Antibody, heavy 220, light 210 residues
Framework: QVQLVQSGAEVKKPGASVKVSCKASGYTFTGYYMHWVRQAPGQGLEWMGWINPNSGGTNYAQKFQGRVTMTRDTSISTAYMELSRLRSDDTAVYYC????????????????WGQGTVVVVSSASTKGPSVFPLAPSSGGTAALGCLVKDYFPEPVTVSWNSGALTSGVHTFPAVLQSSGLYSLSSVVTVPSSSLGTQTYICNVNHKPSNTKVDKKVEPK | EIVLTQSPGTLSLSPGERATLSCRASQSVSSSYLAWYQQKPGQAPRLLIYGASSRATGIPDRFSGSGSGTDFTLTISRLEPEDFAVYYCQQFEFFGLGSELEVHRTVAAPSVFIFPPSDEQLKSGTASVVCLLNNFYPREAKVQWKVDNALQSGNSQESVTEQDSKDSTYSLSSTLTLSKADYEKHKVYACEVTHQGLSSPVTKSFNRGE
């Protein structure tokens, strides 16, 4: 019943300092070392360092030597990690882990993991999405959708007819544009004959901007 | 600088077959400190094997691993629907880049669609054209933009959905970013698709202002 709970997703500007937490639940907090692992969005795992909660001693990776400091709070069961002097390539998911149940398999085969904390490092501000339709065309079936362009930060939810249509829907992952704002599209395949009668409505929701939008999709 | 190199990068298999993932270290390492992980989209990794041989607490008997010195293997028999994920190899600080287990399916052709920019979007000063590919296999596909008849490059971004749970197909959508001036300077816009399921490259196009 060992459980590790981390902080929520955060967005910061290059040069700042982000601190993420990791709370233990079902074991003596000071009895086991606590590691930190970074995973880039498209890449793999990267080890940062461990902190011994009993003494506060640390040992950081060579790459983050001088940029990271790991602290702990024994009153609570929370172990902190702070990454200073951020830049763009620090955008990743940050996990906290803990060694397994064995004794001499090493302190590195981690059996217990946290849920991860998403950290996005960018210079952009919060912007709301702009929804544009994709009109159907002329065989056996036709496709159509709406385009979500220029919004920050991720994510957004996309549904159809207020959640009344599931089959045929394909919501693609976003893409980071050179301007710093994300963009995505979501389509749906429907019978080509129900084009003039059945009405199709897009639903876009962006919480960081507090923007709810319903859009009309119709052939031009 | 122990470097762990695990292969193959992609392994397409059907349920009920055998799976073998090899992790080859650059220099000799100790088998008592190796680990195998599994990670599915959106979750944290699971510990599968520790020490190269022993299986983590709670993983089924169909997972096994061995090796010594340079080369270590991970074998999974009786593939289940939930066993298609990414598998990592670890030794102390050093990790492997990963190996993916894909669902195998018969070859499927992508249904190509295109959508001209909206009249609403042309008010902002930028135009966007989107090419759509629906339900295809395998994942490997190439989409090339052709304004008029000149190959475009550097102004596109692509997004690929994850493999489907039922039919195990893929979907791809590529976007084209042009300004209102560059959009009004040309007539024909096309995006052709090259896929092993297509006997010949399929080109869907439209004409601006028509």
């Amino acid at each position: 019943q060992v459980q590790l709970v981390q902080s929520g997703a955060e967005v910061k500007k290059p040069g700042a300092s982000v601190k993420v937490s990791c709370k233990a639940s079902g074991y003596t907090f000071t009895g086991y070392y606590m590691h930190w692992v970074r995973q880039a969005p498209g890449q793999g795992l990267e080890w940062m360092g461990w902190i011994n909660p009993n003494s506060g001693g640390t040992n950081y990776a060579q790459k983050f030597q001088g940029r990271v400091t790991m602290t702990r709070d024994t009153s609570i069961s929370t172990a902190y990690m702070e990454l200073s002097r951020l830049r763009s390539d620090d955008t990743a998911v940050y996990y906290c882990a803990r060694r397994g149940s064995c004794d001499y398999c090493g302190d590195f085969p981690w059996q217990y993991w946290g849920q991860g904390t998403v950290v996005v490092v960018s210079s952009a501000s919060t912007k709301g999405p702009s929804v544009f339709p994709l009109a159907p065309s002329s065989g056996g079936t036709a496709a159509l959708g709406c385009l979500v362009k220029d919004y920050f930060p991720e994510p957004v939810t996309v549904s159809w007819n207020s959640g009344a249509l599931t089959s045929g829907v394909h919501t693609f992952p976003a893409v980071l544009q050179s301007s710093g704002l994300y963009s995505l599209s979501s389509v749906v395949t429907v019978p080509s004959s129900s084009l003039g009668t059945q009405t199709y409505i897009c639903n876009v929701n962006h919480k960081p901007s507090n923007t709810k939008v319903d859009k009309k999709v119709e052939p031009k | 600088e122990i470097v762990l190199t695990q292969s193959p990068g992609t392994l397409s298999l059907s349920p009920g077959e055998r799976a073998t993932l090899s992790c080859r270290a650059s220099q000799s390492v100790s088998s008592s400190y190796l680990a195998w992980y599994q990670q599915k989209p959106g979750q944290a990794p699971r510990l599968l094997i520790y020490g190269a041989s022993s299986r983590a607490t709670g993983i089924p008997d169909r997972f096994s691993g061995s090796g010594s010195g340079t080369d270590f293997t991970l074998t999974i028999s009786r593939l289940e629907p939930e066993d298609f994920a990414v598998y990592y190899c670890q030794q102390f600080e050093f990790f492997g880049l990963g190996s993916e287990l894909e669902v195998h399916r018969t070859v499927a052709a992508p249904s190509v669609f295109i959508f001209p920019p909206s009249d609403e979007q042309l008010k902002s000063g930028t135009a966007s054209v989107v090419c759509l590919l629906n339900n295809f296999y395998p994942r490997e596909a190439k989409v090339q933009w052709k304004v008029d008849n000149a190959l475009q490059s550097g102004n596109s971004q692509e997004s690929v959905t994850e493999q489907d749970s039922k039919d195990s197909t893929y979907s791809l959508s590529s976007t084209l970013t042009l300004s209102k001036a560059d959009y009004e300077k040309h007539k024909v816009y096309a995006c052709e698709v090259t896929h092993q399921g297509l006997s010949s490259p399929v080109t869907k196009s439209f004409n601006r202002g028509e």
